[PDB]
Amino acid sequence: AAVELAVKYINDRHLPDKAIDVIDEAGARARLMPVSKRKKTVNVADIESVVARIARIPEKSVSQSDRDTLKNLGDRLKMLVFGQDKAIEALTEAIKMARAGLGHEHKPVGSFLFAGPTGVGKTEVTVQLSKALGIELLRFDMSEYMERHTVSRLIGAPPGYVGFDQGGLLTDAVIKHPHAVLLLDEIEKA
Amino acid sequence: LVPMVIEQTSRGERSFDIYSRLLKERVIFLTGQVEDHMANLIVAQMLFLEAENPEKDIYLYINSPGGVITAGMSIYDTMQFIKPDVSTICMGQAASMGAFLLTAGAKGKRFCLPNSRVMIHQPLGGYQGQATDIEIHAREILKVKGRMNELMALHTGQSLEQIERDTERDRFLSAPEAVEYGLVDSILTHR
Amino acid sequence: LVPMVIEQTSRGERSFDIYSRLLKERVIFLTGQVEDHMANLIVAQMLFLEAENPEKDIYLYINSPGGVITAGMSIYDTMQFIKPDVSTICMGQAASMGAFLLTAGAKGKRFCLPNSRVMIHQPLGGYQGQATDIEIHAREILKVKGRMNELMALHTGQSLEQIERDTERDRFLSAPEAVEYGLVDSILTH
Numbered sequence: 001a002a003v004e005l006a007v008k009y010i011n012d013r014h015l016p017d018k019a020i021d022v023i024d025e026a027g028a029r030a031r032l033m034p035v036s037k038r039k040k041t042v043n044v045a046d047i048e049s050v051v052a053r054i055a056r057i058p059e060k061s062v063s064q065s066d067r068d069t070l071k072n073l074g075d076r077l078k079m080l081v082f083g084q085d086k087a088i089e090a091l092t093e094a095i096k097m098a099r100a101g102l103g104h105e106h107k108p109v110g111s112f113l114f115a116g117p118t119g120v121g122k123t124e125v126t127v128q129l130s131k132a133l134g135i136e137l138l139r140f141d142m143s144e145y146m147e148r149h150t151v152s153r154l155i156g157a158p159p160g161y162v163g164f165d166q167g168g169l170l171t172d173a174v175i176k177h178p179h180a181v182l183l184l185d186e187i188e189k190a
Numbered sequence: 191l192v193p194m195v196i197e198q199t200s201r202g203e204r205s206f207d208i209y210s211r212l213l214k215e216r217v218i219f220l221t222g223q224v225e226d227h228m229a230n231l232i233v234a235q236m237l238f239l240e241a242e243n244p245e246k247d248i249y250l251y252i253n254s255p256g257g258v259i260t261a262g263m264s265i266y267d268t269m270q271f272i273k274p275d276v277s278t279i280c281m282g283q284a285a286s287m288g289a290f291l292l293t294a295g296a297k298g299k300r301f302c303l304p305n306s307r308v309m310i311h312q313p314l315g316g317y318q319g320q321a322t323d324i325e326i327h328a329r330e331i332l333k334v335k336g337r338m339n340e341l342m343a344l345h346t347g348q349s350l351e352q353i354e355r356d357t358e359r360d361r362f363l364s365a366p367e368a369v370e371y372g373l374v375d376s377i378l379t380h381r
Numbered sequence: 382l383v384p385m386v387i388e389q390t391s392r393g394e395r396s397f398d399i400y401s402r403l404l405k406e407r408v409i410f411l412t413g414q415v416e417d418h419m420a421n422l423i424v425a426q427m428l429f430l431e432a433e434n435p436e437k438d439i440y441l442y443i444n445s446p447g448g449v450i451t452a453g454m455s456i457y458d459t460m461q462f463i464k465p466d467v468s469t470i471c472m473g474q475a476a477s478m479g480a481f482l483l484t485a486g487a488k489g490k491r492f493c494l495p496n497s498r499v500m501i502h503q504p505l506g507g508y509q510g511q512a513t514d515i516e517i518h519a520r521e522i523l524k525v526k527g528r529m530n531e532l533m534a535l536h537t538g539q540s541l542e543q544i545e546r547d548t549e550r551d552r553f554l555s556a557p558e559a560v561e562y563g564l565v566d567s568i569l570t571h
């Protein structure tokens with residue numbers, strides 16, 4: 001599990017080192033977690049938890065421990081956002097298939113486009129999903145990115161700037177929050 | 191002068207003339223005497239709209255007082271060839287050629303305003319020359335009348351004999367009479 | 382030469398002609414002898430304004446000396462058909478057909494300047510040829526005369542007898558007298 005879980009999530013490091021680090025960390029965690037005379041065997045649950053923190057995952061995505069949250073995710077969002085319930089059922093179903101291991105192997109969980117009148121709660125349902133799932137909300141106004149020069153800011157920095165710890169604004173923002181909703185507004189203007 | 195109009199598009203505002211703005215909505219305008227030049231513009235609009243959506247119906251407003259019959263065939267043939275059904279609306283008045291194009295619309299899409307007029311009369315032409323030449327031209331104009339009466343009967347649904355009697359001399363058909371005669375399906379009041 | 386007027390927009394300044402700018406304010410102008418081409422232009426403006434706002438009332442000025450009756454009907458039918466209420470403002474000479482458009486204006490919104498002149502007369506036309514042909518054209522003009530007289534009594538409200546008598550011969554009516562005849566609601570206060 002550790003080798004497979006590390007290859008898919010921890011892509012920055014190479015395979016032998018990443019697998020050994022989660023094995024060494026898992027053992028050390030098992031040493032500090034119990035007060036005295038506790039279970040010696042290391043379950044996958046413990047393995048999943050350590051890999052999650054390394055990848056910055058909130059430990060909920062690794063295994064479907066919080067199945068109750070998915071059961072009432074639609075109802076919770078439906079009450080907060082009155083109307084357009086058809087939209088909410090599609091977002092929840094996408095989250096369930098991915099958390100059940102039926103998601104895309106090399107694609108985002110769900111790519112969605114909200115085509116609707118301005119003022120309707122398109123962003124609202126997005127914000128309530130982030131708050132409900134306990135994940136950062138990344139809001140980008142594409143209206144700002146209407147010129148060729150602005151596009152470069154997404155991937156890269158201004159010429160002559162090292163930008164070692166800042167890099168892109170979109171690329172680095174997902175690194176800090178791997179499990180986070182990415183919202184783009186007025187994409188047509190982009 | 192043609193007044194300009196502004197439309198809203200995602201990238202930026204779009205400025206179009208009033209006539210071209212209506213073209214985007216499949217609304218063609220047939221005004222004035224028919225001619226080979228104006229008719230060429232009408233067929234050009236029809237062909238352009240077909241590619242955009244060959245399913246959506248075209249709307250051809252008719253406020254023409256009549257014109258050459260040759261140019262009308264280009265519009266009539268074009269209307270039948272294209273898949274989209276052409277909706278003919280008689281604005282103000284429709285003469286012999288205009289009425290021919292009016293009735294040429296798809297069944298169910300032919301309309302006339304309550305105050306519009308519809309005139310129909312045999313083709314008018316003249317040739318001055320030698321007897322031998324006049325013979326050929328006389329036959330041709332008569333053949334042209336035969337081709338118009340047969341096609342009018344097909345669209346209107348009246349017998350060839352009835353059209354010949356009615357078309358022998360000029361006749362003015364009001365908006366309600368056109369529905370009874372069979373030139374249009376009904377008056378344009380509700381939609 | 383028609384002058385151009387700059388328009389103020391948040392994105393950027395735009396240039397439009399004086400007539401086109403007025404169209405943005407739902408103002409349509411009418412002048413010169415009524416013609417088929419001129420009428421279709423006014424009709425196009427009416428349809429465009431209807432789609433923009435079918436509730437906002439339209440304003441239609443009239444300074445024409447009269448023209449063909451057939452083309453004028455195209456404007457009348459459109460005004461009745463379109464949901465917006467046209468506010469006919471007689472700014473100058475209004476002949477038989479020009480005056481007809483004023484009556485077609487929605488009740489309660491018809492207006493006429495105090496010094497404007499509105500003259501009404503029977504339709505004028507003629508034909509020459511064989512007697513059989515003259516009969517058809519003669520009957521047609523008489524039928525058209527009835528239709529215009531009948532529709533005149535509809536908007537004005539006067540009896541057919543009264544309309545026939547005033548229209549049998551050339552009649553010139555001032556602005557205050559028009560209110561008595563029901564041709565116009567009332568003169569503009571300011």
Ligand SMILES: Nc1ncnc2c1ncn2[C@@H]1O[C@H](COP(=O)(O)OP(=O)(O)O)[C@@H](O)[C@H]1O
Pocket residue numbers: 080081082083117118119120121122123124125
């Ligand atoms: N269905 C809804 N239920 C509750 N509030 C809503 C709903 N739709 C819109 N709103 C409110 O409207 C405002 C704008 O919503 P937002 O999603 O930002 O609009 P838009 O998608 O047009 O940018 C917010 O105050 C939001 O809470």
